[PDB]
Amino acid sequence: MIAEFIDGLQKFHFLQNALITAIVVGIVAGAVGCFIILRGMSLMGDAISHAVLPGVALSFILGLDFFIGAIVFGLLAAIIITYIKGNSIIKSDTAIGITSSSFLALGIILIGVAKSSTDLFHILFGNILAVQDTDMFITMGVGAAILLLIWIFFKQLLITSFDELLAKAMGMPVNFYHYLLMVLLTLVSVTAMQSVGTILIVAMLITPAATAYLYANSLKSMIFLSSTFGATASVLGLFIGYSFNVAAGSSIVLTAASFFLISFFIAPKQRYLKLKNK
Template sequence: MNYEFLQRAFVTSVIVGIICGIIGSFIILRGMALMGDAISHAILPGVAISYMLGINYFYGAVFFGILTAVGIGVVSQHSRIKNDASIGIVFTAFFALGIILIGKAQTATDLTQILFGNVLAVRSSDMIITIIIGIIIIMCVVIFYKELLVSTFDETLAASYGLPTKWIHYGIMLLLTLATVASLQTVGVVLVVAMLITPASTAYLLTNRFSVMIVLSSFFGALSSVIGLYISFQYNLSSGAVIVIAATIIFIIVFIFSPKQGVLFKALRTRKIRVH
């Protein structure tokens, strides 16, 4: 913590772990893991265009993230194409466009960091944007927690209560886009879906209460970010990849030793039943 760049990396990685844990909890319970993957890849052309225009990548990434969510909704709602197929059509098209634009851009090194993440190279402006995004996401979840909770578990019930389920869905898509943009420097476009899914899945194995799941998911996301940051700095490894590996190892530990859902305890209970 004596180095300024490590201080920025520490703050950024912790915030990214927290917000990915929060949004990931909604994503996996709503069955939208593929949507997270789609948006994380579809923002690539926005990042490339931003670099080519010399502006902050935040603007281009958010624009293409929102465009992806709207495009998927339009295709699935106004045709016979199902949601998963529309996701595949839209995000692969944008991802392909991003690859073409990367080839045209002059800042290939920076774009490689966006693809695979390099939290040790995070700038002060990136850290500030991440902090602002974190505050926005946390405030939105706290303010609209009841609406998000009801629509996540039973969309039909939420509609009967008069809740605008369609706008809630697009609101979550916007928050997902912001979380993805915040994660670019930390884990990159390719690995961001792992930070959205793995910590939340780990928490899902430990509790049946949604509020507790969000807290645990945020904790596991932050913990894996800190562990990955330390190891990547000590051994000169890719920060994004190490953070994801740390999150995966935590998941495996919980997957085996979870008191209620763990494989080990399930096997012991099954053996005890057979003995009786």
């Protein structure tokens, strides 16, 4: 079972593209995911994943680039979320719930009129085994762009995530780096559609990062661990789905969930259960 998987990666061109795409998604989603959970944006990660769908669908029929539509509809949601709060008694979480599900429903309608039933199922859940070369190289390009952007603004993202009140006292544009992460989040979301699909994007952001949060002693250490857990969980899940003939996206997420479950007990910081016991 392990032997023929290695053999398949040598023969087949579709399994090679599945491996490289799964790796890159796992690395980049886990890297961005660190900032998502540290800044308290776990909900927003799920909301933007849903808000991107109608933009990706509308960008297809118009004949435009997939990443452009994701940002427009991704920002339209964030505008509405803030606009609902600012002009009514509707709470924040309710505004995020209404706008995310409404955009999700809109996306399903726009996909249905243009594309087939199998395309909708794949957009929502994965299709890692049928990614083309152009999609693979663009995923590497945009994925590497996300990483080097974080590398450039690492010091600025550090203070704003840890101590935003100190950043404001120094005169830093805290709003600029908030929108930067949301611009990066949309690029991760459309990239993650290939492996885990629209419905399970949130898992690839928060689950590896949450696991790395239990171990890491620094932001750099946390990103490295979050990407390693995400990348490893992406490879194992591919091996699980391909061999046992089960959903690749769910297998990838369950592997990440099991890493969190194992780490929840065996992590040094988690072994402060002795504190609560006595």
